[model samples]
Target chain A: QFAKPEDAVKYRQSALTLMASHFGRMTPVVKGQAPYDAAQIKANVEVLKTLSALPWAAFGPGTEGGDARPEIWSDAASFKQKQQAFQDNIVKLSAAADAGDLDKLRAAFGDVGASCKACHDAYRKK
Target chain B: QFAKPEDAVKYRQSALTLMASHFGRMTPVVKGQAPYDAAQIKANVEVLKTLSALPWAAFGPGTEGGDARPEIWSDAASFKQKQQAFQDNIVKLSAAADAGDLDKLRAAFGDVGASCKACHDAYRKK
Candidate 1:
C-alpha cells in the first residue's frame, strides 16, 4: 500500500517509535516512581493497543531496512510468532489496566516489555 | 506521566508525527493515484482515530517546543477547538471508510485534510 519502499520504512518506524514512546511513559507508573492513575494508564494503553498491531503490515518484501534484521524476511515464522506474543501481552496489559489493579498491571507490563525485547533481539538490527 | 518536560515534548511530537504519517498515506488513494481498498483504509483510519486524541495531554504546563506555536499553551481554547475539529473530521472519515463508498470516503478525506491544514496553519510553528 505504500508509494515507495522508503515510505514503508518511514511508516513502520513512525508506528514503532510512537509505540515505544507510549510504552516507555508507563515505566514510572509501574516502577512506583509515579502515581498509578488507572484511568490514565488505561487510556494510554488503549492507544497503544491500536499501535501494537500496526507496523507488521509495512514489513512486506522490498520494504526492508530501518533497524530491521534480514531474519525478519528469512525467518518469517519466528518473526510472526514473536509479534503474536507481543500482541497477546498487549491484550493482557489492557486487561490489567481495565481492572485497575497495579499488581496485575506491573506483571502484564513486564511481560509485554519482555516480548518487545525478545522480538528486537531476534529481528532488529543491533 | 512524563519524567521531564522534554519527554512530554517528545511524546506529543511522536503522536502528532504518526498521526500525520497515517493521514498523509491516504492521500494517494483520495487522489485516485492508488486504488481505494476499503478494508485497508478502514483499518488505517481506525488507528488514526486513536492517535487523534493522544497529543493533547502532553501539551500540559511547561512542555513546549517541537513545531508547536506558543498559541497551543497561551490560547488554550482555540487550540482545543482546532484539535476537536480535527478529531471530529477523523470520526467522519472513519465512518466513510466503514461504508466502503469511495465517493463518500473521498469527500470525507478532503474535509479531514482541510481540518488538518487549518490546525497546522493556526498552531504549528514555521
Candidate 2:
C-alpha cells in the first residue's frame, strides 16, 4: 500500500516531518526565540538551501518509496524553477530574518510559500 | 466553470485579490518600508483578521457561490479552529512586523502559512 513498498510511507512521512520542522523552526526566531538566533536562522536557511534539490531529486519515474508523480521528472525544467524559488526565497527569508525586519520577513515568508505552492500546484497530488 | 457559477468565480477572485494584497503589502512592511510601516502592517492584519471569519462563514453548507467543500461544513469545529488559527497567526505576524525583528518575522511568517495550509488541506480543491 506504500509508495516505496517497503518504506514509501516512511519516506513521505519523513519528508513531511522535515518540511514541518523547517517551517516551525524558522518561525520561532521571527516570533522572538533565543534558540532561533540570526546565525541559527541562517544555518537553517543554509540547510534549506540544500533542500532546494530535494523534492524533484527524490521523485523520479517509478522511483519506489515515494508518491511523487513521474510528471515531476518529465517536466524537469518546471521542477527546477520551483526548486530555484525555494533557494531564492530561503535566501531572502534568511536575509529578512537576520535583518530583524518584520516587513521584509513577512514578504519573504509569503513569497517563499508562493514558491512552494507553484510547484505543489503542478506536481503534488493535493 | 467557476465555483460560484452565478458569481462564485467573481467572489473567489475578489477574495483571492484581497488575500493577495493583504499578503503582499504586509510583508514589505515587515521587511522594512515606510509605506509598509508597523502601523500599516497592523492595519493590514486588522483587515486580515476580518478575513478569518469569512471562509467558514462563506463555506457554510450549500453556500452556492464559493469553493467551499461539504466536508468543511461537516466539521464546523475543525473549520472554526482553523479560522481561529488564521486569526492567531495574523496577529503574530503583525506583531513580528511591528517588533521589526527579522527572526521573529521569520517565525511568524512560517507559522501564518502553516495556518493557511492547515485549512487548505481540508478545504481547497487542489
Candidate 3:
C-alpha cells in the first residue's frame, strides 16, 4: 500500500503510535487509579479495536526498520501468532467494555499488554 | 484525557498524522493515478471514519501548540463548524464507498479534501 520503504515505516509507526494513545488512556482505569466509566471506556475501546488491526500490513517485505527486528520477517509465523493474540484480547476488551465489567476489562487489558510486549520483546529493537 | 499539554499534543499529532496517511493513500485513486478498488476504498474510509473523531478532544484548553494555530482556541465556533463539515463529508465518503459508487466516492472525496484544506488553512500553522 506504500510507495516506498520509508512510507511504509511512517504508516505503521503512525498506526502503532495512535494505538498506544488509545490503549494507554485506559491504563488508569485498569489499575483502579481512575473510576470506571463504562460508556467512555466502550467508546475508547471501540477506537482501539479499529486501530488494532492496522500495523501488520505495513510490515510487508522490503519494508523493514523502525525498531522492527529481523525476527518479524524471519519468523513470520510467530509474528502472526502474536498479532492474533493481541487482536483476540482486543475483542475481549471490547466485550468487557460493552458489558461494563471492570474486572473483565482489566483482565483483557492486561492480556493485551502482555501480547504487545511479547511481540515487542522478541521482534523489536531496543 | 491527557496528563499534560504535551501529552495532548502528542495524542492529537499522532491522530492527525495517521489521518494523513489513510487519507493520502486514497489520493491516487481519486486522481486516477491508481485503479479504484471498491473493497479497499471502503475499508480505508472505515478507518478514516474512526479517526475523524479523535483530534478535537486533544485540542482542549491549555493543551495547545503542535501545528495548531491560535485561532483554534480563539475562534471556537468556526473551528467546530469546520470540524462538523469535515465529518459530514467523511460520512458521505463512507456511504459512497459502501455502495461501491466510484463517481460518488470521487465527489465526496474531493469535498473531503477541500474540507481538510479549508480547516488547515484556517487553523493549522505552516
Which is the leading candidate under TM-score? 3
Ten residues in sequence with the least summed lDDT for candidate 2 chain B: B1-10
Q: lDDT (0-100) at residue A28 of candidate 2?
A: 52
* Candidate 2 structure quality by residue, lDDT tens digits, A5-116: 3343343434444444455555655555534355655655654554343334345445544445567768778877777777778788878877866667667877887887
Mark the regions of model 3 whose C-alpha exceeds 4 Å error after superposition: none
- What DockQ does predicted model 1 obtain? 0.59
Q: Quote model 2's TM-score.
A: 0.40
Give a tens-digit lDDT track for model 1, residues A4-122. Answer: 88878877877887798889889989999989899999998998899899899989998888899988998899899999989999999999999999999999999999999999888
Please give the fraction of native interface contacts (Cα pairs under 8 Å between A and B) kept by each candidate: 0.65, 0.00, 0.74
lDDT of 3 by residue, A8-54 (tens): 89888888988998899899998999998899999899999999999
TM-score for chain B in model 2: 0.68
Task: Give the per-residue lDDT digits (tens) of candidate 2, residues B1-126.
Answer: 123444333434344444544565455544555343455555556555543333343343455434566666677788788878787888887788778566686678778878878888897766
lDDT of 3 by residue, B23-102 (tens): 88898898889998999899999999999888888999998788999999999999999999999999999999999988
Top-lDDT structure, candidate number: 3
Residue A46 lDDT in candidate 1 = 92
Candidate 1: residue A91 Cα off by (Å): 1.8
Worst 10 residues of 3 chain A by lDDT: A9-18
Q: TM per model?
A: 0.89, 0.40, 0.96
